[PDB]
Write a protein that binds this ligand. Structure first.
Ligand SMILES: CCCCCCCCCCCCCCCCCC(=O)OC[C@H](COP(=O)([O-])OCC(O)COP(=O)([O-])OC[C@@H](COC(=O)CCCCCCCCCCCCCCCCC)OC(=O)CCCCCCCCCCCCCCCCC)OC(=O)CCCCCCCCCCCCCCCCC
Ligand SMILES: CCCCCCCCCCCCCCCCCC(=O)OCC(COC(=O)CCCCCCCCCCCCCCCCC)OC(=O)CCCCCCCCCCCCCCCCC
Ligand code: HEA
Ligand code: HEA
Ligand SMILES: CCCCC/C=C\C/C=C\C/C=C\C/C=C\CCCC(=O)O[C@H](COC(=O)CCCCCCCCCCCCCCCCC)COP(=O)(O)OCCN
Ligand SMILES: CCCCCC/C=C\CCCCCCCCCC(=O)O[C@H](COC(=O)CCCCCCCCCCCCCCC)COP(=O)(O)OC[C@@H](O)CO
Ligand SMILES: CCCCCC/C=C\CCCCCCCCCC(=O)O[C@H](COC(=O)CCCCCCCCCCCCCCC)COP(=O)(O)OC[C@@H](O)CO
Ligand SMILES: CCCCCC/C=C\CCCCCCCCCC(=O)O[C@H](COC(=O)CCCCCCCCCCCCCCC)COP(=O)(O)OC[C@@H](O)CO
Ligand SMILES: CCCCCCCCCCO[C@@H]1O[C@H](CO)[C@@H](O[C@H]2O[C@H](CO)[C@@H](O)[C@H](O)[C@H]2O)[C@H](O)[C@H]1O
Ligand SMILES: CCCCCCCCCCO[C@@H]1O[C@H](CO)[C@@H](O[C@H]2O[C@H](CO)[C@@H](O)[C@H](O)[C@H]2O)[C@H](O)[C@H]1O
Ligand SMILES: C[C@H](CCC(=O)O)[C@H]1CC[C@H]2[C@@H]3[C@H](O)C[C@@H]4C[C@H](O)CC[C@]4(C)[C@H]3C[C@H](O)[C@]12C
Ligand SMILES: C[C@H](CCC(=O)O)[C@H]1CC[C@H]2[C@@H]3[C@H](O)C[C@@H]4C[C@H](O)CC[C@]4(C)[C@H]3C[C@H](O)[C@]12C
Ligand SMILES: [C-]#N
Ligand code: CUA
Ligand SMILES: [Cu+2]
Ligand SMILES: [Mg+2]
Ligand code: NA
Ligand code: NA
Ligand SMILES: [Zn+2]
Lengths: 514, 80, 259, 46, 79, 227, 57, 93, 41
């Protein structure tokens, strides 16, 4: 029974639970890697005495946090648990293929571990650019194991995208149009379309890297007429959609959380929120070269990519202002999930504004490959994603488990994390403006003060992560079972009780046309 | 060109046997008529060709997967 | 008892065996490229084939033999196959991007020209044109097969599907011979790299598509398809037209314009 | 069928809170410890 | 002709950030010119402008590799 | 170079970097307008027990909050693009200098007249002379004439690197097989520091750039003495 | 050939509680055990190879 | 042409065949169609079939509303949408 | 939300034990590795 249920699953809730457990474990790995980064930088000099190892830690930090923590939690965990419930569907369209999307991830993560254990690791950056990642500067198996890890994670997510698009298009009640589905469901559909289109381009690029390393191709090698910059275009043609894939489900969850704890039946400006996510999805394919402003790019191309990148703040702003308009007039409930969502709005706004600074290619010349970029994305993406994940985890933990958290402990956890992440990343703006490069294991002495503060911040967030594990333990240890949940008339995922039965919507909802 | 009414099974069989397979037969003629080995060019050890940055994982490491001794020189030239 | 039309699938081991097959194929390729051993790779290829066989066997059991493919389920499988094809188009787009990048701006090491100095392309009017006629003809014959099935005609469906498969096999054998006869190789700089990786992945998809047509041929021999319900045949035909269209873009781009 | 309800729709037991603490300790502690041991491993090769 | 040479001037054929083809073209031009002069008897001095431009722009290792390949018979450009 | 506790950009050494500072100040004035506006508005939404939970009509306010951001973006874009096209303007250099990245050092070639080239490596910490800067000094500085337009050409003989000098607003990737051009003009004599800015392996943190800007006549005699 | 789909429909609809991947009979169980043994055995072997390759030789 | 290809009438089975036969009779036991609303007064409530004693209703109170209002409808006296008041009555079994 | 009182209440002492064990599970192994870094180097 245990194997049938948990290794042979065809159930969207159990698969969602598997993804949440996997993603929480990966988040411990990715946090430990981030603390090694900050320990190496927390005083001047060398800590590891091996900067190849430092570079391997940085590279694996980003792959773990992106491919094994955020994407599995947002899309595999919250998407599988919540999407079918929010449309009244009995499961996903392809419930068995869904289980393979999950089970490809432990082997993908094993390949990434393997890459770091063999030879000297892949000390490449998560961009994996050649020729550093080629077979002369990274001879041996580490980079190929990293490529294969990415291939498996890509297949997992492409099949998952197929599943989500199909389920959301085909399995709603017959009377429910796409403009009657909740915003989280929209955010997953759009994320899935971005995955479907972008991950095959990454797969092509990393396969060309694999063949340059092992089959004597020269896609990226000038000796054969190849070009390192071609790899960067293929990588970033995926990688820009990827940053929106990482945040879009978070936007969906934030819309639900802000609406719920405002005591509202609906988000402000629903169609504008759909418009904004669709626009971000579409424009997310035409801006990638802003990751390449220093490669030797012609001025008119720089001007185009600057302008297209600026156009994206418009639909993103409709979403920030619409979250503020949802709060307006609300019966505000200061629950821990609401605190996470308000933290998200603040931090995402800070990070999006420093992205606007970066969009100007002339300023980006001076800021590229410095800690100002690291500060932009740890606000707008890394901590935007983590605060939306924690808001959604706190808000929906009683649905998934049937038990309540201790809200006082959850508010203490939020307070510690908010101090920690701001102490960690805010000073990195100053480091970047004053010229400290990213991807460095040590720094000229002038940069000591802000690196020291940033590293002390990183230990505050460690304390918060340890406390989060205790908080989850205390909830399962005390077994406070949920009774009543407010606002079920506009939050269908709760209407089957906590936790919902294994099969839900065996009799579908009744929705008429009128 | 013409019919355009029903595109049914009978029309698609008519197109298969009346246009598609005759085309394949004509191109098969055209090909098996220009076939016949052509003189291999002087070997020149150009550096952008016969790339070897890592031995191939088969054979002696130095032969491509569908190596044809008649027309594929090694980095050192044609085989004897 | 359910009162919706969707399919709750029995708990299955094939997702796990497929995931493990992917681990074994990739760790196997690593072992082959770096540790001079084919052992893991051969295990992974075997378990991958076993997984595909049993998973798709079970889908036939669920549909032809158990009746779980209601119109709603079939509609989801249509979207799933269309979206899968879209992802494969974007995979090829990356290799077309590589090809145009390198051939539109040939670097000094090539001689600053395309085709590079020392490269002697195949004549596109010889076997490449024959291959084009073969795949176009197979798109006509598969359309005959489809209409025969819809019209209830077993014999002509089988004849037309057999002709389609024969043409797919003809393309594959012609392409294998062209690979052997080509004077340039995958190691012949970016011309060889783009040519063999892009045509090579295309050839893989021709083999996959031909295999799928063969599955459909044997299912047809066993009377699985009705004149109105035969989504495996439709999916194989859509995949086969995708393989044809990818070939037309390779022929125009790499063989013709790139000569 | 399968068990349903709180504490039953999860692949780990919560019947005993102290056994649960041990299991959660090993689970999250193994993920957090792994990078430190990988670093140790790489340093010990030099 | 125009001597007072400080460095290679702006060339509208190569207005952008990648100047690889500028180096390459002047190297080819100098060597084509040199060939035409040393053969038809004349003076390579008429080739001098291309020499100065490619020597200004081209990395030493590129020039050295290209010279080695011309000697070996493996230079892939046309001279 | 940066100094301890610095918050913003290094002081400008070239007119282009001065332009960037003024444009960054402009962008920041706007950034601080938007940030404080958001903070003030969100705080307002969160500080009343008055409620209004019925459906709210959206279209009017969505016009305000699309059109205002679009106007702001145009107010950033216009000076941004002017600086971009100004940095692109031909300036007629007096000198061309190449730099080749390597793991892990830079080489320099000054081949307009004579065959002058040398390598430039970080001074190890144990060998710094008293008062020299850890991780920033080199053995052989890039001596250049002050007050003159210089074309730098940047490439690499192995992996990617990136040649950067923040106080001159310069960062140009060094890519094998590619010759990237940038121009440099220092308004002042002195020593201007940068660091390799594309991860290139284990010693990426330790291959810095030091420009030494002096009058032409001293650059000429230095060049001759380096042959 | 003859249409024997009805016989297979009867077989795969028999009310015997078997999941679809085993409902054909004992051959399914054999093929399943072969596949799972190769997968789990191969996975252990891959872990062995990782152990081997994690150290210099 | 010739024959030899089975029809759905001959060979469809299981749930597919159930849906096909019900459609011929104009019935929708597997909920493939959206039900059409009545006037929804207490005299003419919307009639909600169920195989049990409760079913979830979603009410799109006005055409084009993006918010759906969801509630359990139980066997017994008709209930009203909590947003618009339109009436629904469960018709079990 | 409303909920039942805990089925198995976790007293302040029990929470101090769970918190201490949780923190030690993260701190002791990493602390051992970092304390011994120079030994590895
Ligand atoms: C034993 C242990 C061995 C361990 C190690 C071995 C390594 C093997 C690798 C794995 C391959 C599969 C192994 C299957 C072995 C078991 C077969 C058996 O004993 O009886 C089963 C079976 C009895 O049916 P059942 O399973 O009880 O039915 C439910 O009921 P019905 O009788 O009406 O049945 C109709 C039949 C459907 O009717 C059929 O007969 C379908 C036959 C499909 C043929 C597939 C041919 C593939 C051919 C390759 C051609 C390659 C090149 C083409 C390119 C040219 C260009 O439905 C099925 O049985 C399911 C068929 C599977 C459908 C999905 C198949 C996808 C295949 C993917 C395999 C991947 C390989 C790709 C290779 C690409 C080239 C490198 O016997 C058959 O009907 C024929 C089976 C032949 C299998 C060959 C597969 C290859
Ligand atoms: C954001 C989260 C913030 C969390 C930590 C908050 C602390 C920052 C206090 C709260 C934020 C205020 C920023 C302090 C910047 C000082 C400055 O004048 O910086 C100038 C420039 C460079 O300028 C120069 O040419 C040199 C400046 C002159 C030096 C004299 C000192 C005068 C200021 C003293 C600052 C001391 C160091 C602070 C060290 C802080 C360490 C944490 O630096 C920069 O560009 C930094 C660019 C960061 C981009 C931020 C995006 C929007 C965030 C604003 C917060 C939202 C609402 C406000 C109100 C926010 C209230 C919550
Ligand atoms: C969640 C992930 C995420 C998201 C959403 C974003 C969103 C944005 N990013 Fe960021 N970015 C990253 C993750 C993300 N980014 C990562 C990981 C990298 C580096 C990758 C690497 O190199 O490793 C990076 C790097 C990166 C660069 C390259 C810098 C460099 O390498 O030198 C640039 C350049 O333009 C950029 C810009 C932006 C912009 C303009 C947005 C916009 O989408 C933001 C829009 C949001 C707002 C603007 C705020 C809300 C709006 C209002 C309140 C309205 C009014 C506003 C105005 C009028 C301006 N990003
Ligand atoms: C989602 C993405 C993500 C996240 C979450 C993080 C989190 C952190 N990052 Fe991240 N980081 C990157 C993505 C991310 N990073 C990327 C892409 C790079 C660039 C790599 C390269 O240059 O190639 C990078 C690089 C980078 C650097 C620069 C390295 C260099 O340039 O040399 C630094 C430096 O301080 C840093 C620090 C941190 C810290 C201290 C944290 C965290 O410790 C902050 C606090 C957050 C947590 C503690 C998260 C906990 C969440 C969980 C545990 C999940 C729980 C799950 C459930 C409840 C279900 N990161
Ligand atoms: C005839 C068509 C099919 C060919 C099949 C041969 C085996 C290949 C299997 C997969 C094919 C897919 C593309 C793989 C890339 C390279 C193969 C390209 C096509 C090919 O077969 O290229 C041959 C070289 O193969 C070589 O290197 C060896 C290639 C063998 C190892 C391939 C490694 C696998 C690559 C990983 C794929 C990852 C995909 C992830 C997607 C997500 C060309 O032979 P040549 O002697 O150089 O020149 C001819 C001279 N007379
Ligand atoms: C370097 C080498 C790396 C190698 C990595 C290899 C990784 C993976 C190993 C793959 C093992 C495959 C095993 C067979 C999978 C069959 C999936 C399938 O066919 O899934 C179907 C859905 O997807 C559909 O249709 C449409 C989708 C069909 C997808 C079929 C599988 C494709 C796998 C690879 C494709 C990747 C994309 C490449 C382009 C980037 C059916 O869905 P189920 O939920 O099962 O059933 C639903 C029931 O109602 C059916 O009666
Ligand atoms: C929806 C439709 C919207 C259409 C908008 C326009 C988009 C399509 C562009 C199609 C490509 C047209 C290119 C034609 C002009 C040739 C440009 C070129 O050839 O540029 C080369 C790249 O080409 C290249 O293949 C580029 C190859 C294709 C790149 C495609 C980028 C988008 C990919 C989408 C994938 C899905 C790069 O080198 P240059 O910068 O030239 O520098 C040479 C120097 O030596 C100068 O001294
Ligand atoms: C090293 C490489 C390893 C080998 C690679 C793969 C080799 C060959 C695989 C060839 C693919 C065979 C697919 C067989 C599918 C059989 C099952 C099937 O066709 O199932 C049909 C449903 O379609 C379905 O799920 C459709 C689902 C199938 C989608 C398949 C698409 C191909 C995917 C192949 C993987 C590609 C990866 C490429 C990466 C470069 C059943 O419904 P119907 O037909 O309506 O019948 C019911 C009627 O009888 C009722 O009256
Ligand atoms: C169902 C689960 C299946 C698990 C299967 C487990 C397989 C266990 C046997 C492993 O066999 C290894 O394969 C290697 C292949 O590399 C051999 O290397 C040898 O053979 C190679 C091939 O030429 C060369 O590397 C050398 O000759 C030599 O070291 C080596 O002797 C042998 O130990
Ligand atoms: C970034 C994540 C890491 C964050 C901070 C970790 C905080 C430290 C927790 C304590 O860790 C322990 O510290 C002891 C020292 O206090 C070590 O004992 C060591 O030192 C002792 C005292 O000298 C000896 O008694 C022991 O045998 C010797 O192992 C012990 O091994 C280690 O487990
Ligand atoms: C027409 C469409 C859907 C309306 C509906 O059917 O409910 C609405 C939804 C969001 C609207 C857009 C957003 O509100 C954002 C923009 C607001 C500007 O005031 C007009 C253009 C603008 C781009 C709007 C155009 C149009 O009214 C949109 C696109
Ligand atoms: C035996 C069978 C009759 C089918 C049936 O009604 O059972 C017939 C009808 C169509 C025939 C096939 C088609 O005519 C196509 C092929 C024609 C080749 O000449 C022989 C094999 C070939 C594949 C045939 C084999 C066999 O004779 C088939 C399959
Ligand atoms: C952001 N890109
Ligand atoms: Cu050289 Cu970084
Ligand atoms: Cu981007
Ligand atoms: Mg860079
Ligand atoms: Na350090
Ligand atoms: Na059809
Ligand atoms: Zn209503």
């Amino acid at each position: 029974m245990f194997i049938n249920r948990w290794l042979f699953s065809t159930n969207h809730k159990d698969i969602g639970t598997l993804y949440l457990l996997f993603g929480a474990w990966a988040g411990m790995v990715g946090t430990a890697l981030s603390l090694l980064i900050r320990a190496e930088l927390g005083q001047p000099g060398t800590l590891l005495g091996d900067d190849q190892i430092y570079n391997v830690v940085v590279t694996a930090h980003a792959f773990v946090m992106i491919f094994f923590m955020v994407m599995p939690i947002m899309i595999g965990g919250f998407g599988n648990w919540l999407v079918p419930l929010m449309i009244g569907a009995p499961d996903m369209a392809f419930p068995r293929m869904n289980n393979m999307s999950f089970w490809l991830l432990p082997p993908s993560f094993l390949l990434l571990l393997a890459s770091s254990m063999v030879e000297a690791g892949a000390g490449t950056g998560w961009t994996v650019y050649p020729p550093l990642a080629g077979n002369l500067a990274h001879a041996g198996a580490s980079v190929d194991l990293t490529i294969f890890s990415l291939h498996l994670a890509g297949v997992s997510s492409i099949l998952g995208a197929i599943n989500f698009i199909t389920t959301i298009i085909n399995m709603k009640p017959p009377a429910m149009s796409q403009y009657q589905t909740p915003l989280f469901v929209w955010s997953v559909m759009i994320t899935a379309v971005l995955l479907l289109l972008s991950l095959p381009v990454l797969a092509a690029g990393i396969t060309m890297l694999l063949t340059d390393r092992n089959l004597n191709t020269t896609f990226f090698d000038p000796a054969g007429g190849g070009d390192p910059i071609l790899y960067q275009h293929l990588f970033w043609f995926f990688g820009h959609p990827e940053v929106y894939i990482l945040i879009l489900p978070g936007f969906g969850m934030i819309s639900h959380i802000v609406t719920y704890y405002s005591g509202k039946k609906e988000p402000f400006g629903y169609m504008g929120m759909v418009w904004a996510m669709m626009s971000i999805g579409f424009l997310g394919f035409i801006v990638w070269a802003h990751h390449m402003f220093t490669v030797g790019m012609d001025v008119d191309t720089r001007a185009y990519f600057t302008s297209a990148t600026m156009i994206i703040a418009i639909p993103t702003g409709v979403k920030v202002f619409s979250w503020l308009a949802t709060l307006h007039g609300g019966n505000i409930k200061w629950s821990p999930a609401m605190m996470w969502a308000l933290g998200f709005i603040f931090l995402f706004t800070v990070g999006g504004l420093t992205g606007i600074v970066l969009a100007n290619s002339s300023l980006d010349i001076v800021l590229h490959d410095t800690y100002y970029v690291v500060a932009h994305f740890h606000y707008v993406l890394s901590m935007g994603a983590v605060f939306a994940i924690m808001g959604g985890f706190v808000h929906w933990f009683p649905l998934f488990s049937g038990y309540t958290l201790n809200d006082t402990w959850a508010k203490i956890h939020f307070a510690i994390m908010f101090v920690g992440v701001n102490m960690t990343f805010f000073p990195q703006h100053f480091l970047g403006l004053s010229g400290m490069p990213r991807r460095y294991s040590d720094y000229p002495d002038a940069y000591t003060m802000w690196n020291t503060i940033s590293s002390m911040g990183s230990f505050i967030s460690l304390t918060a992560v340890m406390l989060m594990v205790f908080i989850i333990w205390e909830a399962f240890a005390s077994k406070r079972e949920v009774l009543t949940v407010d606002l079920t008339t506009t939050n269908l995922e709760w209407l089957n009780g906590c936790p919902p039965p294994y099969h839900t919507f065996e009799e579908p909802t009744y929705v008429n046309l009128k | 060109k013409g019919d355009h009414g029903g595109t049914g099974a009978r029309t698609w069989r008519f197109l298969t046997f009346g246009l598609a397979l005759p085309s394949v037969a004509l191109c098969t003629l055209n090909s098996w008529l220009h076939s016949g080995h052509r003189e291999r060019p002087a070997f020149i050890p150009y550096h952008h060709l016969r790339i070897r940055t890592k031995p191939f994982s088969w054979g002696d490491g130095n032969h491509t997967f569908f190596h044809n001794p008649r027309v594929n020189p090694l980095p050192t030239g044609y085989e004897k | 008892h359910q009162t919706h039309a969707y399919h709750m699938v029995n708990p299955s081991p094939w997702p796990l065996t497929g995931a493990l097959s992917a681990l074994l194929m990739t760790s196997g390729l690593t072992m082959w490229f770096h540790f001079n051993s084919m052992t893991l790779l051969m295990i992974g290829l075997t378990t991958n084939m076993l997984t595909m066989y049993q998973w798709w066997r079970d889908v036939i059991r669920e549909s032809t033999f158990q009746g779980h493919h209601t119109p709603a389920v079939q509609k989801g499988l249509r979207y799933g196959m269309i979206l899968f094809i879209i992802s494969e188009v974007l995979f090829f787009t990356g290799f077309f991007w590589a090809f145009y990048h390198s051939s539109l701006a040939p670097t000094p090491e090539l001689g600053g020209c395309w085709p590079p100095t020392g490269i002697h392309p195949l004549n596109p009017l010889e076997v490449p044109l024959l291959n084009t006629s073969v795949l176009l003809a197979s798109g006509v014959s598969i359309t005959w097969a489809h209409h025969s099935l819809m019209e209830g005609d077993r014999k002509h469906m089988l004849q037309a599907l057999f002709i389609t498969i024969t043409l797919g096999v003809y393309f594959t054998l012609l392409q294998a011979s062209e690979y052997y006869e080509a004077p340039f190789t995958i190691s012949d700089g970016v011309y060889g790299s783009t040519f063999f990786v892009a045509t090579g992945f295309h050839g893989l998809h021709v083999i996959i598509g031909s295999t799928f047509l063969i599955v459909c041929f044997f299912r047809q021999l066993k009377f699985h398809f009705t004149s109105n319900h035969h989504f495996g045949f439709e999916a194989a035909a859509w995949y086969w037209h995708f393989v044809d269209v990818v070939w037309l873009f390779l022929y125009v781009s790499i063989y013709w314009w790139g000569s | 069928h399968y068990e349903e309800g709180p504490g039953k729709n999860i692949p780990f037991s919560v019947e005993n809170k102290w056994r649960l603490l041990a299991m959660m300790t090993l689970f999250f502690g193994s993920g957090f410890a792994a990078p430190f041991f990988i670093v140790r491993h790489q340093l010990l090769k030099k | 002709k125009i001597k007072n040479y400080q460095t290679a001037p702006f060339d509208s054929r190569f207005p952008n950030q990648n100047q690889t083809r500028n180096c390459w073209q002047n190297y080819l031009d100098f060597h084509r010119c040199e060939k035409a002069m040393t053969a038809k008897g004349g003076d390579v001095s008429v080739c001098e402008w291309y020499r100065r431009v490619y020597k200004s722009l081209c990395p030493i290792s590129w020039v050295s590799t290209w010279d080695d390949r011309r000697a070996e018979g493996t230079f892939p450009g046309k001279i | 170079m940066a100094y301890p506790m610095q918050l913003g950009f290094q002081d400008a050494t070239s007119p282009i970097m001065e332009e960037l500072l003024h444009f960054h100040d402009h962008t920041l004035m706007i950034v601080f307008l938007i940030s404080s506006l958001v903070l003030y508005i969100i705080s307002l939404m969160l500080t009343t027990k008055l409620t209004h939970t019925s459906t709210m009509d959206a279209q009017e306010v969505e016009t305000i909050w699309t059109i205002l951001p679009a106007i702001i973006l145009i107010l950033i874009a216009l000076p941004s693009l002017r600086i971009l096209y100004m940095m692109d303007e031909i300036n007629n250099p007096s000198l061309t200098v190449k730099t080749m990245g390597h793991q892990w050092y830079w080489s320099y070639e000054y081949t307009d007249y004579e065959d002058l080239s040398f390598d430039s490596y970080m001074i190890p910490t144990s060998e710094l002379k008293p008062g020299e800067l850890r991780l920033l000094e080199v053995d052989n500085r890039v001596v250049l004439p002050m007050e003159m337009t210089i074309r730098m050409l940047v490439s690499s003989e192995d992996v990617l690197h990136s040649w950067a000098v923040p106080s001159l607003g310069l960062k140009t990737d060094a890519i094998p097989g590619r010759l990237n051009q940038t121009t440099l003009m220092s308004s002042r004599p002195g020593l201007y520091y940068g660091q390799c800015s594309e991860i290139c392996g284990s010693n990426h943190s330790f291959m810095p750039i030091v420009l030494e800007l002096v009058p032409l006549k001293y650059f000429e005699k230095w060049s001759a003495s380096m042959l | 050939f003859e249409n024997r789909v009805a016989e297979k429909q009867k077989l795969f609809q028999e009310d015997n509680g078997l999941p679809v991947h085993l409902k054909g009979g004992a051959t399914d169980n054999i093929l399943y055990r072969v596949t799972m043994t190769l997968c789990l055995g191969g996975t252990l072997y891959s872990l062995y190879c990782l152990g081997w390759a994690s150290f210099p030789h | 042409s010739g024959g030899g290809v089975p029809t759905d009438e001959e060979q469809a089975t299981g749930l597919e065949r159930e849906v096909m036969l019900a459609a011929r009779k104009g019935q929708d036991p597997y909920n493939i169609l959206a039900p059409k609303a009545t006037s929804g007064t207490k005299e003419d409530p919307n009639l909600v079939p169920s195989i049990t004693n409760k079913r979830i209703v979603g009410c799109i109170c006005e055409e084009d509303n993006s918010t759906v209002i969801w509630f359990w409808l139980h066997k017994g006296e008709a209930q009203r949408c909590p947003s618009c008041g339109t009436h629904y009555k469960l018709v079990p079994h | 939300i409303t909920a039942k009182p805990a089925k198995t209440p976790t007293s302040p002492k029990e929470q101090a034990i769970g918190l201490s064990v949780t923190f030690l599970s993260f701190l002791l192994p990493a602390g051992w590795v970092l304390y011994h870094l120079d030994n590895y180097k």
